[PDB]
Design a protein around this nucleic acid. Structure first.
Ligand code: SY5
Ligand code: MG
Ligand code: MG
Ligand code: MG
Ligand code: MG
Ligand code: MG
Ligand code: MG
Ligand code: MG
Ligand code: MG
Ligand code: MG
Ligand code: MG
Ligand code: MG
Ligand code: MG
Ligand code: MG
Ligand code: MG
Ligand code: MG
Ligand code: MG
Ligand code: MG
Lengths: 101, 127, 151, 114, 82, 99
RNA sequence: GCGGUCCGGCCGGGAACUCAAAGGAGACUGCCAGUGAUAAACUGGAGGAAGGUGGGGAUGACGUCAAGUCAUCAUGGCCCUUACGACCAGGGCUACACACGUGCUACAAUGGCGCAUACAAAGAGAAGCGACCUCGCGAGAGCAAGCGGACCUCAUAAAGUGCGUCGUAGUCCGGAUUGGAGUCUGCAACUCGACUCCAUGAAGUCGGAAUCGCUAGUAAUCGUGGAUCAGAAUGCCACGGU
């Protein structure tokens, strides 16, 4: 799916764990009300924007791991709907057989 | 002594204990007028003891689980007959012609892909 | 059907009386699976037949059913590009089915407040051989001996 | 008989007939009557001048009548003067809150013109 | 409707305004920030707002305060069908 | 104190020989066993489109079953604890111990 | 079934029953009448939970339409290469005289509203599901245990039943549209989110020619769950009630 689109996903994920899941303190408890309700929170709402436009966990598209498809994704397998069927008929997804109820 | 039966209907399951002598019907620690608000449901639990005359002649201790109102009442009627056939062994051919021994095996059909329901198909247009 | 020909399915009696023709009448009235609400209308309408116009509760429903029953009907029988309306004898299980549907469909297009009162007046009008359920029966019989020559 | 709202309500129940006043819906009508101490199954015939006049004072506290029509037309005139996005949707009869106009804008656009 | 704990503005617009206010106005101030809130500090300024291809000059009146800057630059060209 | 062992697998024949080996083996060195308990079977379901491009109504449906067995041992003698640790069963069977 | 109780399966206890999931049995025209060409086979009866492939699913023969997909992927040929490749901000895919398809909600009394009270199945959960308690009319906020789960949570099933009111009206039917005030997710809610509160209260009174689905736990009607997913279903995939 256009090689550079695969690279956008792998840069976004490296820059998000560079800053966030540690530098969430600016919104984690700086934006909730106690003695920090003065201009310090207002300094946070502005300081949270100078970190790069990436770095946020809500800009990851979650593509398929082999083909890079943006649609038809399944979080349980990490593959697109095409690749889970292509790989389930060969017996390579464990325990995943055809359901009949 | 108690004579036990198991009856089941759509998704309901009923356990039934009968003891000799009373006209007591107790179901889930409630009486019949408090448990079944529907009189059709009231009249299908009385069906097997109206064919066989043990109305003031046999007590009944009932529990039910699952399903809804009419589903639970049908599971009981099936469970009373199994209890009364352990009691006597010769009320069987009386009850087979009443259709109370057949377990009604009609279940909900699963929803199918491409269909709006189990069998309802979406609206077709020629063009 | 062509091949799978059918037995019958069984109806339960009514609880208060023990009649299945009465239970077929509740089935025909029932809308959207609401069976408890159809018995409420059917039970309340029948005793409000009884002491408003004449006793013997369920005898009064069968006698109101005696008049709206058809004996002949028309049916179309195709030949080669010409369809005649041929008068047919109606069968006794089809007699009650057409009579109960015409009573229920007469009661829906009325002007009374409730459905149990619309039912009660249409059943009362059927006992006096009046109303619209009787005239639905009259038009079927008029067309049948109008096409007597195509028998 | 009539309110500060110059309307004339009629003989329904009082919680229902107070909604005849423009600017008063269902929970203002229950709050008006709850503050007057009047039960809601009472019509307006049955209801005194000492109870119609006391109903007028608390209704006279909300912004309920043609004073509210001015404040509503104030705020539309407002948007129509800034030339903002909501003002260009208002002067055009097109839906304002971002609904679909490709199909199904028929309340805001009126009956269709070919 | 953003929640009541902080209105939003960019940093580059926030700082470019405050320097431009203490000097008299100017050129129209070029920005791409359609999402930033107009503040009380900006009454009198002219801000050229991007709309996709152009920058529409908006002279801030008092009654534009509280709105977003993108409301005063239409992004869509449309004039009739027939 | 009863030590409690839960076994998870996608296969029911593999899981029963994992129960049978720990049911074998606590009784090897003399413990109370209740035996195996069937916990409820978890079925995960999946429904995929099978065409690469359109045709919404053509699909395949897959599932994964997860079989559960529970056996508790309330004689944990010290011949048991490391003799329970020296046991080599299959690679499809997840064991989780817990007190 | 017993002992006790706070009268809660609650505690000892029991392994009976429901249930959980492994194994086994059972249905085969097996038995019997009659019909049919000493046939096959058919109609009917008994027993049985089930009777004639018991219900439902998966399973799509040789081929047809040069059917669909070079955009999931792979790949022959051709073409671009300081650009038809790569990075960034803002916009657009949501435009709007109009026409069509598939849906949702309605046009009410077999109903609307108000109070009280019953009976499900199946699914999901760790940068998640999130009880109790407190604040808020509400969406929600604070605090915050339990749960990698037959245990904890999502999570209060709705139609139903009992009582009351409305009394056939553009209505106490309908809830579109618009104004104001908010909540949450997220760098960010203007273009262009969902939801809450107050107000507003459109069309619509059963739909021309035409046309669609369904043979039984089906149609019709009523709620619940899941994937995708920070947020964002009237769609889709599942589950039960009548
Ligand atoms: C929505 N409801 C309204 C109602 O209840 O009447 N039903 C309908 O609109 C369909 C209508 N009942 C009958 C129609 O399909 C057949 N008539 C054919 C006309 C000429 N082809
Ligand atoms: Mg590639
Ligand atoms: Mg996303
Ligand atoms: Mg269903
Ligand atoms: Mg479809
Ligand atoms: Mg009003
Ligand atoms: Mg929208
Ligand atoms: Mg078995
Ligand atoms: Mg038989
Ligand atoms: Mg390019
Ligand atoms: Mg599109
Ligand atoms: Mg739009
Ligand atoms: Mg009512
Ligand atoms: Mg009307
Ligand atoms: Mg009108
Ligand atoms: Mg209303
Ligand atoms: Mg109204
Ligand atoms: Mg989501």
């Amino acid at each position: 799916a256009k090689q550079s689109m695969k690279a956008r996903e792998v840069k976004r994920v490296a820059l998000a764990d560079k800053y966030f899941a540690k530098r969430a303190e600016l919104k984690a408890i700086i934006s909730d009300v106690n003695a920090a309700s003065d201009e310090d929170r207002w300094n946070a709402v502005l300081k949270l924007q100078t970190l790069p436009r990436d770095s946020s966990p809500s800009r990851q598209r979650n593509r398929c791991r082999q083909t890079g498809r943006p649609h038809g994704f399944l979080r349980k397998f990490g593959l697109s709907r095409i690749k889970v069927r292509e790989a389930a008929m060969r017996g390579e997804i464990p325990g995943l057989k055809k359901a009949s109820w | 002594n108690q004579y036990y039966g198991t009856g089941r209907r759509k998704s309901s399951a009923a356990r039934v204990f009968i003891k000799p002598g009373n006209g007591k019907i107790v179901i889930n620690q409630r009486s019949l007028e408090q448990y079944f608000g529907r009189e059709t449901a009231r009249m299908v639990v009385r069906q097997p003891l109206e064919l066989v005359d043990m109305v003031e002649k046999l007590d009944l201790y009932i529990t039910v689980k699952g399903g809804g109102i009419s589903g639970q009442a049908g599971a009981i009627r099936h469970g009373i007959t199994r209890a009364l056939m352990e009691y006597d062994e010769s009320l069987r051919s009386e009850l087979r012609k009443a259709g109370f021994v057949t377990r009604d095996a009609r279940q909900v059909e699963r929803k199918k892909v491409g269909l709006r329901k189990a069998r309802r198909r979406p609206q077709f247009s020629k063009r | 059907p062509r091949r799978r020909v059918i037995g019958q399915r069984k109806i339960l009696p009514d609880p208060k009386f023990g009649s299945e023709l009465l239970a077929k009448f509740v089935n025909i009235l029932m809308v959207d699976g609401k069976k408890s609400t159809a018995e409420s209308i059917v039970y309340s309408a029948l005793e409000t037949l009884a002491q408003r116009s004449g006793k013997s509760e369920l005898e009064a429903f069968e006698v109101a059913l005696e008049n709206v029953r058809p004996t002949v009907e028309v049916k179309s029988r195709r030949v080669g590009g010409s369809t005649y309306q041929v008068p047919v004898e109606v069968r006794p299980v089809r007699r009650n089915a057409l009579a109960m549907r015409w009573i229920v469909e007469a009661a829906r297009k009325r002007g009374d407040k409730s459905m149990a009162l619309r039912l009660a007046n249409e059943l009362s009008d059927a006992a006096e051989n009046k109303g619209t359920a009787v005239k639905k029966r009259e038009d079927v019989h008029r067309m049948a001996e109008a096409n007597k020559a195509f028998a | 008989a009539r309110i500060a709202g110059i309307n004339i309500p009629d003989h329904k129940h009082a919680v229902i007939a107070l909604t005849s006043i423009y600017g008063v819906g269902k929970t203002r009508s229950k709050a008006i009557l709850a503050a007057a101490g009047i039960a809601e199954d009472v019509k307006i015939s049955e209801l005194s001048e000492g109870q119609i006049d006391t109903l007028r004072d608390e209704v006279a506290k909300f912004v309920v009548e043609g004073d509210l029509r001015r404040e509503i037309s104030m705020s539309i005139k407002r948007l129509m003067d800034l030339g903002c996005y909501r003002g260009l949707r208002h002067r055009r009869g097109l839906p304002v809150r971002g609904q679909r106009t490709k199909t199904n804008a028929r309340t805001r656009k009126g009956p269709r013109k070919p | 409707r953003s929640l009541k704990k902080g209105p939003f503005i960019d940093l580059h617009l926030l700082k470019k305004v405050e320097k431009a206010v203490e000097s008299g106005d100017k050129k129209p101030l070029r920005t791409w920030s359609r999402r930033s809130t107009i503040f009380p500090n900006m009454i009198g300024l002219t801000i050229a707002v991007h709309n996709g291809r152009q920058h529409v000059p908006v002279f801030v009146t008092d009654e534009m305060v509280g709105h977003k800057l993108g409301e005063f630059a239409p992004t869509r060209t449309y004039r009739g069908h027939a | 104190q009863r030590i409690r062992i839960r076994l998870k697998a996608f296969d029911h024949r593999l899981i029963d020989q994992a129960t049978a080996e720990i049911v074998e083996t606590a009784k090897r060195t003399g413990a109370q066993v209740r035996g195996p308990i069937p916990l409820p079977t978890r079925k995960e379901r999946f429904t995929v489109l099978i065409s690469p491009h359109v045709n919404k109504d053509a699909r395949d449906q897959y599932e994964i079953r997860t079989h559960l067995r529970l056996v508790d041992i309330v004689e944990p003698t010290e011949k048991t604890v490391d003799a329970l640790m020296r046991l080599d069963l299959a690679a499809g069977v997840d064991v989780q111990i817990s007190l």
